[PDB]
Specification:
Pfam family, one (chains A, B, C): Cu-oxidase_3
Oligomer: homotrimer
CATH class of the largest domain in chain A: Mainly Beta
Largest sheet of chain A: 6 strands, mixed
Strand content of chain A: 35-45%
Bound molecules: nitrite ion, copper (II) ion
Main location (chains A, B, C): periplasm
Shape of chain A: flat
Number of strands of chain A: 22
CATH topology of the largest domain in chain A: Immunoglobulin-like
Distance between the termini of chain A: 82 Å
Number of domains of chain A: 2
Number of helices of chain A: 3
InterPro entries (chains A, B, C): Cu-oxidase-like_N, Cu-oxidase_2nd, Cu-oxidase_fam, Cupredoxin, NO2-reductase_Cu
Structural class of chain A: mainly beta
Pathway (chains A, B, C): Nitrogen metabolism; nitrate reduction (denitrification); dinitrogen from nitrate: step 2/4
Radius of gyration of chain A: 21 Å
CATH superfamily of the largest domain in chain A: Cupredoxins -  blue copper proteins
Helix content of chain A: under 10%
Order of helices and strands of chain A: EEEEEEEEHEEEEHEEEEEEEEHEE
CATH architecture of the largest domain in chain A: Sandwich
Strand order of the largest sheet of chain A: 13-12-15-19-17-18
Enzyme class (chains A, B, C): oxidoreductase
Chain lengths: 335, 335, 335
């Protein structure tokens, strides 16, 4: 009986980081408690000052990643402060029943609720807001994130050998539908409510205006690049709650990848590019072998470079000429 | 030799049901005989009364699912009544040769033809009309359905364990390209041929006006919701003859899924959302554990809730608080 | 050490053919040397005379396929002739470090460079141009191709059994973004640079004007249809550097398919339609069992038949009535 299990509290951290956690654990099932507080806020999403009347869990896109182990119970207190203007709820693709929890968590501004479910299936799973009658708007406006449910004995390759990472990063990719006025410029709305009708018109075209990692063009670049070093193994968690994407790490690979994001299935290896179906989260492991600034992107290259679905990984360490060597630098064609 | 095997006649049923059949069978190979009659008709596809100048196998979108076992031969009599305007035929993705049967089943109005092929590969396979030079149009206007070739000893998990279902449901998803006039309203055409030029313009934009399950918005909802109960295992067969989709059961999972639809391959488990490549049929098993109304949808949520790609499953039974419980109902935040 | 391994030179051949190679080999690792020369050129891409200001590796869309074996080193000399307008480079998805090679092969017109990398992972991998700030334009204008890294002991089925092909064909599929003038007709530009701004605005709409195999509508039809015969096994290599596609052989199957294109993973069998993610190359084997003209296409049928993503395979041999038979030819409905 779950009420009699030990309860532990986890403090969530902002993306792209993930809160500390164990992979293989000797611990038995717990009720792991989390709190998230909804925040509606206008956000600048590109270098030209275009804004999004956004909606978020915990003030970020994506929402923070919640990690537990298979057999644990997730107990979330969802808070919708009075400072907000719209109702919300939460649907966990990792949960069973009641439309993922959305039926049991309808919180209007000024309310909160607490939900518990058993995390009985391992994998990366999307959670997102889903108010009846306007699910897409709330999702495309920013309300999604990942629940990672690791197996108790950690991650395994297809032969049962253990796989281990030194660091997890979480990337949420958001297809945005920002309206334009008659002058062809993006509209800037004084209120969330005012953005609704025009935004739904754009959504229905199925053509996003921007596709961003972690909330804006350039979110994971420059000072905010992800970081690693040669010999380090990273897990890259990638969520897309509404639309397909095809992650790729330029100059690297997916050493082991769960593109459908479910760890009881054997991963695939050596992938150049993988595929995250809209409404899911997948995960890739990679162990760096070369230093340099890598790009991690959606390999529809228009969506990456023109619409924003690209970030970087700055990697420290020593260059390996056996893996790759510039035999002759760019020079005049022999005459 | 095929001519010397026992012949048997199966009566097809209208989607979303699937005609009665065995999973594991003791029976040996048979020539299984099916008849289908092409019906061109004007159908109402949304709640505003928009119409499609539709083309169907047997009067429904999708056509009925034909079920046989691996090793059986399928023998179809395709009738094109005199009252239709156009020539038609049939291409079975499950068959080998002559463009899937299409070159051997060219029936003009007033004609019929009979085709036999060996169903030597197990899986769900799309069949669709494919008249030379008119293929996209006949397919997007409704002419597709599923052939399921069950393995003789039934469905297997990756370790070879048997998987069994209590009820199969068949969902066809249709991307529709309905034209609009200068006033921005959907056009209503008196004849099939009248719809052609305008429909082709809309098709070339690759943007569907509507995406529907089983022929219309709301087809699998209300009185026509699918049904199940706690403890029951359903097989959800999903076809999309022209365009990708990404099925998801909200509040549930894909316990075992063949997203590429081919049963000699091992399935994957615990999927939140899977992927049906345009031009294919796939199949998912799920055993319900909670009662309630579930949504089964294409998890591009715009595609689902704005354009029509969603249905419901009403599930009877007892709520299980271990799996999910409302610890605290929505209430005001302590001030 | 790579410097001391034997070096051999391979002469590339024009798609759809692949240069002669072994599958299983007794040879040890080698540094395999290749040369490619970039050709910018205006090309006619459809039957009404529409032109693309194209960029190519070696004069063709796709660039030729490079075949080596796992553990070999690839050593490419990349030549950008004095007569081209733009800088180029190469990113091998099969290589590790320096953005796939891109940072080490920045060749302005009149320059060349030589890159070595270890092909330590088996599979079909995209290579494509990637000059900083112009990646999408160069890829969609035609600068991509496949590296096939064959395992030393050749292709294997899921149980470890060997799989052998008699002939490989390489199909590169290109989503094109050709601009239109105010009159609604496709623009025809005098120079490459003239095409830039307009092309970028089409690209951002995410809607291709054309999607073609090997450079143009009907490139692989008529006199240029691919060829085979009953009993022959072919390997069909399919690359898409920018956008998803869903290949299908009409009247056939993918007997064994690596849709993510990585040969250390077990393939899937009996596929009707497979899925090549944007930014990847995949591979399918089929053994022909019926003669006739097959269509090989992207099974979004609008993309295939309206936009151009279709070709043909003409197959010689003897019809097999057990696989498929016209029991009754089209004839009047009985009365
Ligand atoms: O490797 N894609 O830029
Ligand atoms: O079988 N696709 O036309
Ligand atoms: Cu919300
Ligand atoms: Cu969802
Ligand atoms: Cu037809
Ligand atoms: Cu087809
Ligand atoms: Cu280039
Ligand atoms: Cu690339």
């Amino acid at each position: 009986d779950a009420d009699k299990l030990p309860h532990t509290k986890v403090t969530l951290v902002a993306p792209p980081q993930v809160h500390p956690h164990e992979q293989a654990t000797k611990s038995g099932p717990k009720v792991v408690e989390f709190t998230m507080t909804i925040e509606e806020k206008k956000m600048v999403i590109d270098d030209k000052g275009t804004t999004l009347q956004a909606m978020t869990f915990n003030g970020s896109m994506p929402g923070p990643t919640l990690v537990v182990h298979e057999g644990d119970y997730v107990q979330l207190t969802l808070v919708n402060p009075a400072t907000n203007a719209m109702p919300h709820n939460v649907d966990f693709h990792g949960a069973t029943g009641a439309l993922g929890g959305a039926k049991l968590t309808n919180v209007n501004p000024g309310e909160q609720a607490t939900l518990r479910f058993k995390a009985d299936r391992s994998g990366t799973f999307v959670y997102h807001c889903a108010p009846e009658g306007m699910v897409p708007w709330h999702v495309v406006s920013g309300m999604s994130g990942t629940l990672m449910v690791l197996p108790r004995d950690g991650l395994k390759d297809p032969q049962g050998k253990p796989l281990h990472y030194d660091r997890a990063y979480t990337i949420g990719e958001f297809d945005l539908y920002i309206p334009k006025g008659p002058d062809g410029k993006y509209k800037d709305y004084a209120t969330l409510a005012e953005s609704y009708g025009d935004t739904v018109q754009v959504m229905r075209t199925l053509t996003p205006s921007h596709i961003v990692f972690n909330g804006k063009v350039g979110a994971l670049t420059g000072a905010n690049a992800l970081t690693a070093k040669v010999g380090e193994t990273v897990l890259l968690i990638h969520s897309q709650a509404n639309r397909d994407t095809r992650p790729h790490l330029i100059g690297g690979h997916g050493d082991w990848v769960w593109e459908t994001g479910k760890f009881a299935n054997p991963p695939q290896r050596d992938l150049e590019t993988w595929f995250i179906r809209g409404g899911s989260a997948g995960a890739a492991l990679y162990t760096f072998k070369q230093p340099g600034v890598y790009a991690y992107l959606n390999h529809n290259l228009i969506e990456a470079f023109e619409l924003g679905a690209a970030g970087h990984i700055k990697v420290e360490g020593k260059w390996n000429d056996d893996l790759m060597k510039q035999i002759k630098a760019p020079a005049p064609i022999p005459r």
